[PDB]
Design a protein around this ligand. Sequence first.
Ligand code: GLU
Ligand code: GLU
Ligand code: CL
Ligand code: NA
Ligand code: NA
Ligand code: NA
Ligand code: NA
Lengths: 251, 254
Amino acid sequence: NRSLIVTTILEEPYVLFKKSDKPLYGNDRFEGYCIDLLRELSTILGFTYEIRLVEDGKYGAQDDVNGQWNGMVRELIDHKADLAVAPLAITYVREKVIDFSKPFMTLGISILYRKGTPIDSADDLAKQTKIEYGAVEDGATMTFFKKSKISTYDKMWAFMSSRRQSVLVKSNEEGIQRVLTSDYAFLMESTTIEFVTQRNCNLTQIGGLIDSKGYGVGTPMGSPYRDKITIAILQLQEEGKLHMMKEKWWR
Amino acid sequence: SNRSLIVTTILEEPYVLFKKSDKPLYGNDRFEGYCIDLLRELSTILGFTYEIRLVEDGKYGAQDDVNGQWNGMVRELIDHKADLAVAPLAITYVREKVIDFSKPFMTLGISILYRKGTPIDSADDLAKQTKIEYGAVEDGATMTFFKKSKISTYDKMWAFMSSRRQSVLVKSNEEGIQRVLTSDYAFLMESTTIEFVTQRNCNLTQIGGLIDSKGYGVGTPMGSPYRDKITIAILQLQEEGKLHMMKEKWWRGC
Ligand SMILES: N[C@@H](CCC(=O)O)C(=O)O
Ligand SMILES: N[C@@H](CCC(=O)O)C(=O)O
Ligand SMILES: [Cl-]
Ligand code: NA
Ligand code: NA
Ligand code: NA
Ligand code: NA
């Protein structure tokens, strides 16, 4: 049968290009937690697949003036991919336009910053401007702030929007480099913060989780794969395989 | 007017309780708790009315391996005796094959409730011994996790629990807690409930970490159009901070 087109995005340790001396081709180019997930789903559900990086390099958000989506979400809306297998947050706004499996990992927004300071919460960032802060452009964290009616978060959005050419970044990698190289705190998902802090010992999580969400496999709205992938994820969780995969990649 | 939805649930503090009062209470007004607040919010978002009914057999739901039949809230949904189950109903592999669930409103895992002051640190330490008995709620998700597991520690635990089932499998969390308090017994329990119980009984503690990871969701019959609508409403309530407020209200030490 037809191979499924799987959209994804580079994001350590979920999706990476493998290091090698010989050039690599096709699906053999990729590794990571989400790549191992995809391999397991493919075996359980009996499909073949072709991995393609999302061409615009975005997770996906809606344009406020023209209403169009971008990123992996737009690829699914337009039926240019069958699945999105990535650290793709299940959110209110996205679930209205695409379908998601139940989550394979749970997480929340938190803060990445340097050690040694009195900053302990988002509220502490919101009430000042000397320490700048920001988020990945056109992802779920940005959209959370953009939509929030909560005073603290609304104040933070006004700051990030004002300063967006500087403080909104195109990747978590760029956000980390800003924390390391300037007085900047990065609003980041907690799973990714756990990976970064285990490797950058001068960095830490500030405060707790601001919210709660899961990562799910995206599908176009109405896809029959959505419920089949949910059941496969639940099987992998119960057998311990997801925990083993997390340990492997967060080591 | 549209037909009221029948909502099956089960008593379990602090998710669903009977309100304390002097005058008798009637109908939906009898109930309070996190899940009751959740139901009220869903009803307003989606625009339905409802009638709360306690599951007749008092069970969450498991399948009989001899006759293949389900019981509990799961069976009430399969049979269309209820439109929704709004309860601390775990989303599990075996259940998602027969009923539908919303995406989770809370995440949790199985862990161990025991008395303080012990060298027992994990499920492995319990599994290797038989002086301290252990068990779970009959016909719920924790029992079914053990019954199905291929992992050596957990399969060994299941063999023990199955052998001693008439004594160590209980009908409710409340009964399990009483057994921990009155005998040398450790109870396999969901972590959100452990947190509630240990906040209020300072002689008790969680032992070890989470054995697994799962969510609670609203159950519906398979194919129900309410499933996706309730998912969207849950996501809205989470993002607005209302689920967090509800958890703080119902879990609000030792
Ligand atoms: N995982 C996010 C991107 C990173 C972020 O927004 O922090 C998403 O699905 O949009
Ligand atoms: N919440 C469980 C019942 C309690 C338990 O199994 O620990 C269920 O949905 O079956
Ligand atoms: Cl779902
Ligand atoms: Na959807
Ligand atoms: Na009960
Ligand atoms: Na009374
Ligand atoms: Na289902």
